[PDB]
Amino acid sequence: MKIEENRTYYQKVSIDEEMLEVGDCVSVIPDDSSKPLYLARVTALWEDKNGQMMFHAHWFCAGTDTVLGATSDPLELFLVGECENMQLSYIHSKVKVIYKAPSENWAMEGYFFQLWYNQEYARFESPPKTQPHKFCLSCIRLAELRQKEMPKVLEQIEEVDGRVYCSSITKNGVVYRLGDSVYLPPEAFTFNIKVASPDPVNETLYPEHYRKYDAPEPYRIGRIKEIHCGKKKGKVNEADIKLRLYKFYRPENTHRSYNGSYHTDINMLYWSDEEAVVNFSDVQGRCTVEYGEDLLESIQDYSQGGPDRFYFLEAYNSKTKNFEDPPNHARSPLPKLRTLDVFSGCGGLSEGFHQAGISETLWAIEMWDPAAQAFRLNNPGTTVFTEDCNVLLKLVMAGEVTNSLGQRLPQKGDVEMLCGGPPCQGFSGMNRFNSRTYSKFKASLVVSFLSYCDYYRPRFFLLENVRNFVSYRRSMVLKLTLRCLVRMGYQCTFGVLQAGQYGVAQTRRRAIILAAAPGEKLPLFPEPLHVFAPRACQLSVVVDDKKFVSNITRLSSGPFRTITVRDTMSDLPEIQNGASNSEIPYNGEPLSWFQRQLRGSHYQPILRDHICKDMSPLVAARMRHIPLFPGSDWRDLPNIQVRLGDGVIAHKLQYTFHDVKNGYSSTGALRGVCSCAEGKACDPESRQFSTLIPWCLPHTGNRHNHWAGLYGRLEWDGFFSTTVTNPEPMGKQGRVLHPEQHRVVSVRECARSQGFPDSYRFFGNILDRHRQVGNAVPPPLAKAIGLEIKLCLL
Ligand SMILES: Nc1ncnc2c1ncn2[C@@H]1O[C@H](CSCC[C@H](N)C(=O)O)[C@@H](O)[C@H]1O
Ligand SMILES: [Zn+2]
Ligand SMILES: [Zn+2]
Numbered sequence: 001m002k003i004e005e006n007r008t009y010y011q012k013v014s015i016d017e018e019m020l021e022v023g024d025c026v027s028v029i030p031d032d033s034s035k036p037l038y039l040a041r042v043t044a045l046w047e048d049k050n051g052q053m054m055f056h057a058h059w060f061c062a063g064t065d066t067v068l069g070a071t072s073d074p075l076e077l078f079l080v081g082e083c084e085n086m087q088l089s090y091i092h093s094k095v096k097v098i099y100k101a102p103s104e105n106w107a108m109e110g111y112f113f114q115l116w117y118n119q120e121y122a123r124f125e126s127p128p129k130t131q132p133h134k135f136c137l138s139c140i141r142l143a144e145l146r147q148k149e150m151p152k153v154l155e156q157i158e159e160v161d162g163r164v165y166c167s168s169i170t171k172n173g174v175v176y177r178l179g180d181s182v183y184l185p186p187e188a189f190t191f192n193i194k195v196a197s198p199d200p201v202n203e204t205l206y207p208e209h210y211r212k213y214d215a216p217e218p219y220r221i222g223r224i225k226e227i228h229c230g231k232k233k234g235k236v237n238e239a240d241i242k243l244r245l246y247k248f249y250r251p252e253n254t255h256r257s258y259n260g261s262y263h264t265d266i267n268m269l270y271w272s273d274e275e276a277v278v279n280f281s282d283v284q285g286r287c288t289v290e291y292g293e294d295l296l297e298s299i300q301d302y303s304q305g306g307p308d309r310f311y312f313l314e315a316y317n318s319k320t321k322n323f324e325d326p327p328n329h330a331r332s333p334l335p336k337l338r339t340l341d342v343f344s345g346c347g348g349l350s351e352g353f354h355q356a357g358i359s360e361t362l363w364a365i366e367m368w369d370p371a372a373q374a375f376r377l378n379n380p381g382t383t384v385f386t387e388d389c390n391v392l393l394k395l396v397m398a399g400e401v402t403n404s405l406g407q408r409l410p411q412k413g414d415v416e417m418l419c420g421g422p423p424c425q426g427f428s429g430m431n432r433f434n435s436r437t438y439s440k441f442k443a444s445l446v447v448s449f450l451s452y453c454d455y456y457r458p459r460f461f462l463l464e465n466v467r468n469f470v471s472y473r474r475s476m477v478l479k480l481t482l483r484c485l486v487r488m489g490y491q492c493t494f495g496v497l498q499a500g501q502y503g504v505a506q507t508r509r510r511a512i513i514l515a516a517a518p519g520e521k522l523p524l525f526p527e528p529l530h531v532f533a534p535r536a537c538q539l540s541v542v543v544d545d546k547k548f549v550s551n552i553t554r555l556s557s558g559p560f561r562t563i564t565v566r567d568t569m570s571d572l573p574e575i576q577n578g579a580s581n582s583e584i585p586y587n588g589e590p591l592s593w594f595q596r597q598l599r600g601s602h603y604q605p606i607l608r609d610h611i612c613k614d615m616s617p618l619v620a621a622r623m624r625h626i627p628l629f630p631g632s633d634w635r636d637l638p639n640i641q642v643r644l645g646d647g648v649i650a651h652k653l654q655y656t657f658h659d660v661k662n663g664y665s666s667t668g669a670l671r672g673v674c675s676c677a678e679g680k681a682c683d684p685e686s687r688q689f690s691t692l693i694p695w696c697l698p699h700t701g702n703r704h705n706h707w708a709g710l711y712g713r714l715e716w717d718g719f720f721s722t723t724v725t726n727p728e729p730m731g732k733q734g735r736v737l738h739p740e741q742h743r744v745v746s747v748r749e750c751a752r753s754q755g756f757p758d759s760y761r762f763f764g765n766i767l768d769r770h771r772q773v774g775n776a777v778p779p780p781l782a783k784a785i786g787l788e789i790k791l792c793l794l
Contacts, residue, residue: 001133009046009133013053015091020045022133025097025111026057028090036062039077039095039111044134045088058083058138060097060113067122067494067543071476071483078117079127083138099127102489102518110412110455114489122548123493124486125522148173151238151280153229165228169241174286179332180224181310182243183284186217186557189245189276191253192318203665207655208635208693210665211706215531215562221248221269221287221310222276241280246330247272248289249316252561262567265593266560267303271315271326287559291331300601307787308559334793336360337459340410341382342389342420342449346374346762346772348754349419349464350382352782358790359417363410365389370764371772377761383407389448393455412456417789419462421777422449427472437473441480450484453515460523460789461485461515464777467496469511475543481513490515491522495550496539499755501528501558503594503780505568506720506753507536510777512785521792525550526784528558533719565739566716567594568752573607577623577743578614580766583607599758608758609747611766617644619729622692624742626711633712633735637693650692661702673698694730710734714745720753725774726767747773755780 001009012021020026020042028038040057047053061080063072077097098112115124128137154168154175168177176182201209222245230240249270251261269289287308295302295311303309314323315330337359341350344364353359364384366372372386385392385407396409403409422445433441441447446463453461463481470478478494485492492515499508516522528537541548571591573584586607590596615623621642626632642650657672658664660679665671672678673695674686688695697707712735714720720735727736727744736744745753747769751760755778762769 006049007046009044011045011133013045013055013088015088018094020091020094025060025095026055027092027095028057028086029092036064037092039097040083040086041097043083043136043139053088054085055088055091056083056134056136057086058136060111061117061119066117066119066124067546067548068479068483068486069544071479072486075111076486077111077113078115078124079113079137080117080119081138081141083136106489106518107457108412110457115486115491120549121493121495121551122482122543123491123522124482125491126518151241153236153238153241156236159231160228163228163230164236165226166241167227169227169280171280171283176224176227176243176283176286178224178227181221181248181287181289182224182245182278183219183287183308183557183559184222184245184278184282185284186220188220188278188282189222189247191247191249192274193253193255193321195257200666202667204667204669205638205640206636207639207653207665207669207671208637208698208701210662210671211635211701212631213706214533214535216534216557218250218531218561219284219287219557219559221250221289222246222278223248223289225275227280243278243280243283245276245278247274247276248310248312250561254316255321262570263591263593265299265303267310269310269312270323271312271330272318273315273327274318284554284557291326294332334358334790337417337789337793338362338414339417339419340415340452340456340458341365342418342452343422343445344375344384345371345421345775346760347378348756348776348779349421349462349782350375350379351756351760352777352779352784353417353419353786355779355783356786356790358786358793362414365392370768371775374761374763374772377763389445389452393448393451396455410456415456415458417460417462418449418453418456418458419464420449420452421464421775422446424465424469424472424477427477428468430471430474433473433476437476441477446477446481447484450481453485453490454488457488457517459517459520460792461490461492461513462785463513465511465513467509467511470494470496470541470543475541478511478513478543485513485515489518491518491520492516493522493550494541494548495525495552496541497525497550497781497785498528498532498537498539499778499781500532500536500562500719501530502526502778502784503530503560503563504753504755504778505563505565505594505718506723506778507533508722508778508781509536509539510781514785516792523785523788523792525552526788527552528554529784530560531558531562533562562719563594564717565714565719567592568720569595569749570716571595571599572610572746572749574741575610575612575743575746576741577612577620579743579746580611580614582609582611584610597757598752598755604759607748609751609762609769610749612743612746613727613766613770615729615744617646617648618650618690618692620742621650622694622711623729623737623744625692626713626737626742628713628740630715630717631712633708634694634697634710634729635706635708637711639693642692649690651688651690653688653691653693653695653698659702671698677702707734711737713737714739720745720750723750723753723774725771727770727774750774754778 039060044056059082060077063076100112100114116127151171157165226244230237251264252258289310292311292313315326339359339361341361341364344366350361367388376384494513590599655670657677659672659677662671675683711729721733750773
């Protein structure tokens with residue numbers, strides 16, 4: 001075809017008398033007899049100066065080598081960026097590979113390949129459509145990637161003492177110029193302020209006390225003052241770009257620290273003339289930092305206007321610890337997708353999407369009446385079907401335009417975005433999928449949701465669920481759900497996100513399956529916004545020993561400080577156990593940035609649903625006896641008799657068995673409450689009733705890390721455990737007591753832990769409302785995901 005200097009390209013070779021062609025597919029026999037046949041596309045054929053007869057192999061990935069594993073169609077191949085030069089003598093045979101393109105009438109459709117597989121993120125995506133003697137998509141992709149990845153100097157200024165100063169550089173698609181701000185790891189530099197690093201009990205009175213035996217810092221931010229690099233071979237050394245920066249102080253970086261900055265905006269900074277030198281390699285991203293007064297709009301409008309937007313109004317003198325005005329040199333010089341929300345709940349997911357500005361939920365389906373009503377209260381514009389999604393779908397299959405109540409059913413073409421959180425019962429744990437199990441899955445609500453996707457063929461598809469959706473039955477639920485989306489021709493991916501990293505004071509890992517129709521861009525998962533406890537941000541998923549991660553790059557830090565229980569509910573009036581007045585005055589102002597977001601700027605004095613469960617006299621007595629010291633839970637309880645009302649008694653727990661593992665106490669007491677503490681079988685009579693210290697907690701404490709957290713108080717500096725449908729002191733994660741008051745958290749406090757605005761309405765009795773709040777997708781999580789979809793609508 002063309003004769004380069006070192007290679008001669010041919011269009012077609014004869015291999016054992018059979019022609020082979022550019023465009024053709026080929027098999028190569030693996031050395032490892034256990035591997036599937038290697039299959040490739042021939043992208044070039046040539047001879048080298050060395051007499052070797054060669055081809056370039058753009059390898060395919062077999063289905064069984066993707067997350068899909070054995071669920072995948074044997075005959076479906078996927079494109080991947082894996083290619084290399086190979087000797088023609090290795091070809092085993094030519095193969096037929098068909099490109100199954102999405103029909104032009106795809107929306108109405110209620111070896112081969114169709115998608116490109118990204119093996120690091122488990123993304124199936126439409127193949128590039130880009131068109132051309134050697135054309136190899138794999139090669140083209142890596143080049144574009146390398147070009148994107150590498151540091152490059154856009155503009156040099158002048159050399160001064162063996163260093164070229166530049167006015168502009170770039171890495172990963174971001175152009176950084178003089179005067180721009182940059183994100184940097186916490187340890188890139190230090191502030192000149194100095195920061196100093198930060199009892200026995202009677203064990204018969206407190207017999208369980210003995211069983212009592214973290215978020216990183218957010219980014220450093222600095223304004224670029226100069227950019228200078230070294231030189232190599234008389235040329236710019238791009239592997240050596242360095243930035244000299246003006247340090248910005250976050251409020252908690254000044255002497256005020258955190259206790260002095262509880263009330264400041266999470267995006268407010270302080271100017272400083274302190275300078276730091278950093279390697280370009282360490283720059284984690286670019287951010288906008290503007291002096292408040294130069295703003296053409298309001299700080300709030302500027303702040304909510306875009307991502308990575310900070311501001312300052314004062315400088316901070318590290319030396320006199322005073323805040324003067326900033327020096328002069330610090331100054332400067334879409335259509336909404338029509339959405340169907342299945343398993344709508346009270347609408348946490350639709351609310352986040354609405355906030356993102358990308359969607360309008362026109363239809364919601366919610367079988368449970370209270371939740372359906374809650375959804376209507378918040379969405380006057382949506383047709384809400386209080387109905388089982390299965391019977392609604394049958395009504396549409398039956399040709400009905402309307403249900404019996406006059407409500408207009410959504411039809412093909414109506415639905416542009418389909419979202420929902422289908423309850424996945426009876427798949428928990430990890431035994432293998434058996435034959436009957438496949439029937440269970442076909443009848444399941446997750447399949448019903450997929451059926452909606454298949455019929456309505458929406459542009460975008462979102463399935464949210466509990467973290468363990470990705471692991472149920474050895475990940476077969478996840479694999480079958482990805483397989484269904486691929487079979488339909490959808491682009492799709494999955495990931496786990498941690499709500500805490502999107503601005504809520506709660507540990508809540510959720511599974512998320514995204515899908516996009518052939519013609520769209522498949523969204524990315526949103527980059528963490530807030531730093532959160534590392535132990536709660538294990539987002540990777542292992543499927544058949546393969547570790548999958550999402551595209552998320554911020555694995556250690558992030559733009560904003562973590563949101564605490566204090567940020568969440570320090571402004572709420574004091575209530576008692578059983579409080580039931582659903583409309584009360586706040587009788588105070590928002591104190592935190594987080595409370596200002598959720599309460600609004602409008603004048604608004606009514607506080608809704610600050611009500612809590614009326615715990616029994618026994619549980620109320622226990623709560624009153626949990627100390628207010630941070631971390632306190634059931635192991636702090638005193639072993640005392642308490643008079644309950646009516647004449648009833650919380651009795652003393654009696655210890656009459658040796659715990660061979662835990663030994664005697666300092667008062668010479670025994671520590672076992674059953675014969676199993678001595679290695680023996682359980683005494684049937686062992687159980688003790690009505691005792692301030694719950695008998696079952698020492699009974700099995702050793703086998704469950706001492707049930708840490710049960711009857712536990714939230715910490716002001718900490719975060720909520722996963723917000724559940726019914727907060728119980730003794731459910732597994734029972735850290736549901738208020739930090740100070742002798743009661744469980746209120747419906748509203750639970751709603752604030754999910755990031756619900758205060759105006760957000762719920763419906764039904766107190767347990768109905770707890771259920772609605774606990775089931776929801778936190779609107780700040782939904783919003784972050786929504787904004788990723790917004791990128792795909794441009
Ligand atoms: N067959 C069915 N059809 C419609 N809704 C169902 C259903 N089975 C369960 N549900 C509802 O599915 C919901 C799951 S919780 C969904 C919460 C929602 N994403 C939010 O952000 O608020 C519950 O409200 C439950 O009542
Ligand atoms: Zn290639
Ligand atoms: Zn026992």
